[PDB]
Amino acid sequence: MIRFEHVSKAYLGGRQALQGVTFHMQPGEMAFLTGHSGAGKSTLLKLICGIERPSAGKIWFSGHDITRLKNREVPFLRRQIGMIFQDHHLLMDRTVYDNVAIPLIIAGASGDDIRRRVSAALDKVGLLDKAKNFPIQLSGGEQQRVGIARAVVNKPAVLLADQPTGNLDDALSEGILRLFEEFNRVGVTVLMATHDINLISRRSYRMLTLSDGHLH
Amino acid sequence: MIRFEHVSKAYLGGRQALQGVTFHMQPGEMAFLTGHSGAGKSTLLKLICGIERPSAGKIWFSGHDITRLKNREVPFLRRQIGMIFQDHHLLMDRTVYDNVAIPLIIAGASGDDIRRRVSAALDKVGLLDKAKNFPIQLSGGEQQRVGIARAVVNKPAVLLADQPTGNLDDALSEGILRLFEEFNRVGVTVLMATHDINLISRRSYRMLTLSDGHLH
Amino acid sequence: NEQVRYAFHGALQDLKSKPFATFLTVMVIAISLTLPSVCYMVYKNVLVGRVSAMIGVLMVAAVFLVIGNSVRLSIFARRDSINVQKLIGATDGFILRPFLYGGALLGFSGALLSLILSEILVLRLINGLSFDECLLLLLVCSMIGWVAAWLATVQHLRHFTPE
Amino acid sequence: NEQVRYAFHGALQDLKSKPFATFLTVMVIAISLTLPSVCYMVYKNVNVGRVSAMIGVLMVAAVFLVIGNSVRLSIFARRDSINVQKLIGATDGFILRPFLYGGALLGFSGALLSLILSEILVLRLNGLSFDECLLLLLVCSMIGWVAAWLATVQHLRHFTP
Ligand SMILES: Nc1ncnc2c1ncn2[C@@H]1O[C@H](COP(=O)(O)OP(=O)(O)OP(=O)(O)O)[C@@H](O)[C@H]1O
Ligand SMILES: Nc1ncnc2c1ncn2[C@@H]1O[C@H](COP(=O)(O)OP(=O)(O)OP(=O)(O)O)[C@@H](O)[C@H]1O
Q1: Mind telling me how many Å the CA of D107 is from chain B's nearest CA?
Q2: Ranges in the Cytoplasmic compartment (chain D)?
């Protein structure tokens, strides 16, 4: 699914977030991405999504070279990916229901199907009672769970999590990790960027460590 | 300093975030605030700062009843407190230096004093080489540390930190805790809401647990 | 057809959310549109016209800029929602349709209020605009709003790109 | 005296950050003010009673509306920075000064540009004097000041407990 070949990324200003990152993740595989602050983890996750473009190397997604994707096929790439952001990127002017249902509206689903799937996704993260509220009327952990539910509603092929357990206690973090494992049991690829060792020490997964934009 | 007497908080719609919380903190004391997601921690911290108004009970800050403060006295209360937010509440259109220096400008300090104090504060959180950058050009942990530096630059009487360790790894979390202890060594009160059981396990401080708006 | 109704409700939900800002926006368009209409009708009912032919173009130029400015600043306050939808994987047209309709109804509402103002002025102190003239004014204002909304939304669109 | 410069610098930074948006904001106010200028010029040189009084108020009613609306939306775009500065402990007067100076400048540039446009029309085909120019500039600046004050005050009553 995911391949990096000598991937480098330099922003406008000379601050190199990455330097020669190369790895490979087979379909349905799960892994952890770790590092210090400023390491370059979110830059890697964004380079996967096509939000940013690498300064060098090649990125392959599902066997298709997305190094130089045109602006017209980017949404078709981003539709197969369920992305959880670090600032949660919500729509503050729409309800929780509309926020979670917008991927299905973009997809073109039916009303009954949308209702059923949004109810199920909200029930997974324990936010079924909070479907009519606006994101202002929620907590930080609740808003993060709204973003998670929005991510896991359209049955993606690849999951990209950008520290999805911050603002969540140990019980909720373990529950969210169990939800991601449940999704991975059916062939979904997961890449979870985080820096809490307590959660990742009790499960043996592939390890990706980032230090000043270098992969080990 | 901080005193709660039978405080209650109910939002618009009937959601009670707190119920009968009462405690007291002596000057220069350091403590932790914990709970599950949605417990009511940020509501408590906001009630201390005067951002929210209690639905019942009384709140005392430095011996002055602030449960019914007039709008003309709120800035004089909030100048004495260094608050760290969960969203980091930065000004995206100003540089890091201006963001850190704005409390001094509001206070009315001279140019050279501003230069010296802001440079020292940015060196405390390890962001001195990023004083000219904009918050868009910063990572999540760096933006959180910018908020921290803005908080600890004006030599406050009380520190209200709300999880200032999310987006920061274990080493940086330890450094931030040591910085807060360094500030508490001169008589600064610290009340820190956190989700990190490992961080609070290795040091013995007062423990305040919140469950569905109830204090233990 | 299914997505047209979703976009139409999206435009009204914004306009209803901030009624004062919308009403103040429309009230500017009605005032800027009611002057050319009185000047046209007083000339129609009644060599100096060639000396005002270069000034008649001045009043009509204001309405192009007022509506264009009005829609531009509305989309700017919502430039965050454009970024969020692009991240999810929405196409360019999907984002565009809510904004095109809101600009069109903004110009249409101003032109409709403009006609009401012109009639009141006539009743104070001659015949007013005909039905065809009213329809033409409404259509032209709607097209102006549509074009302005398209321009502003496309300008904000080529900002959240990987480049 | 120490905060006037800081308020003034912030006012220019907001306008200079988006030159394309600010200039178009300036350009509409210039067009609206040109109409009273030429109409007053013609009436001054030539010279019904109740056939221009209702017209005269119509153009002057526009400049209040065009200036007020332009300041209304510019402040709405930056209403987040009002909340952040209010949390730190800034007073109402501290926040109000940068917005007041932006309102007065916005009208001043628009009135100055309309003076140039009216001068071009006279050259293209006797006009306003220096006193009239100064009066128009002062009136537009006063309107911009009041518009900025109203918008920022209404935004301050929103971010309150
Ligand atoms: N918009 C930007 N422009 C330029 N440099 C940026 C930008 N955003 C981040 N950076 C820089 O790129 C590098 C990597 O940042 P990134 O956020 O990817 O790291 P990270 O390790 O995921 O951070 P964190 O652990 O704090 O979430 C850092 O030097 C960071 O300051
Ligand atoms: N603006 C708001 N309006 C109404 N209810 C709110 C608002 N913000 C939070 N709440 C509710 O108040 C309660 C306490 O939320 P609060 O964010 O204070 O808790 P918390 O324990 O600090 O959260 P977290 O652990 O997720 O950071 C919850 O029921 C929450 O949904």
Answers
A1: 24
A2: 72-102, 154-161
**Phi (first) and psi of residue A73, to 5 degrees:** -105, 0
Total Cβ atoms within 10 A of residue D19? 9
Q: Does residue B12 sit in the same domain as residue B30?
A: yes
**DSSP tally for chain A: helices H, then strands E:** 7, 10
Q: Is the same domain home to A101 and A75? A: no
According to DSSP, the β-strands at A206-211 and A30-35 are parallel
- Determine contact: A75 vs chain B, CB below 8 A: no
Which residues make Cβ contacts (< 8 Å) with residue C39, sequence separation at least 6? C56, C59
Asked, for residue B129, whether it belongs to a domain, the answer is yes
Q: Which of B109, B128, B155 is the last residue of a domain?
A: B155
Look at residues A194, A187, A188 and name the one whose alpha carbon lies nearest to residue A208: A194
Angle, helix D53-77 to helix C49-77, in steps of 10 degrees: 20
Q: ∠A81-A82-A85 over CA atoms, to 5°?
A: 120
Q: Exposed, middle or buried, C16 (CB in 10 Å: 0-12/13-18/19+)?
A: exposed
- Any domain includes B25: yes
Mutation test of the interface with chain D: which of C27, C64, C66, choosing the one with the most D Cβ atoms within 10 A? C66
Cα-to-chain-centroid distance, residue A53: 17
Q: What are phi and psi of B15, to 5 degrees?
A: -85, 110
User: Which SS3 state, helix, strand or coil, does residue A208 take?
Assistant: strand
Task: Report the SS3 class of residue D47.
Answer: coil
Distance A67 CA to ligand 1 centre (A): 20
This structure was determined by cryo-EM
* Of residues C3, C10, C1, the one with CA closest to residue C149: C10
Q: Are residues B163 and B207 in the same domain?
A: yes
Listed residues A155, A188, A203: the one ending a domain: A155
Same domain, A73 and A167: yes
DSSP strand pairing (B30-35 vs B189-193)? parallel
Q: Which ligand is nearest to the CA of B11?
A: 2
Question: Within this chain, do residues B140 and B163 fall inside the same structural domain, yes or no?
Answer: no
Is residue A10 one of the residues assigned to a domain? yes
Tokens of A136: 């202002």
- Nearest Cα residue in chain B from A38: B139
B86 part of a folded domain: no
Total CB pairs under 8 A between chain A and C: 46
Nearest CA residue ID for atom 25, ligand 1: A37
Task: Specify whether A147 is located in the same domain as A47.
Answer: no
Burial class (CB in 10 A: 0-12, 13-18, 19+), D4: exposed
- D40's tokens: 């007053």
Total number of domains in chain B: 2
Q: Which of B211, B213, B199, B184 is nearest to B25 (CA)?
A: B184
Q: Does the beta carbon of B142 sit less than 6 angstroms from any atom of ligand 1?
A: yes
Mutation for testing the B interface, residue in D5, D87, D159 having most B CBs under 10 Å: D87
What is the domain extent for residue A113?
Answer: 90-155
A76 and A163 share a domain?
yes
- Residue A167 near ligand 2, beta carbon < 6 Å: yes
For the CA of A15, the nearest ligand:
1
**Cα B126 to ligand 1 centre (Å):** 15
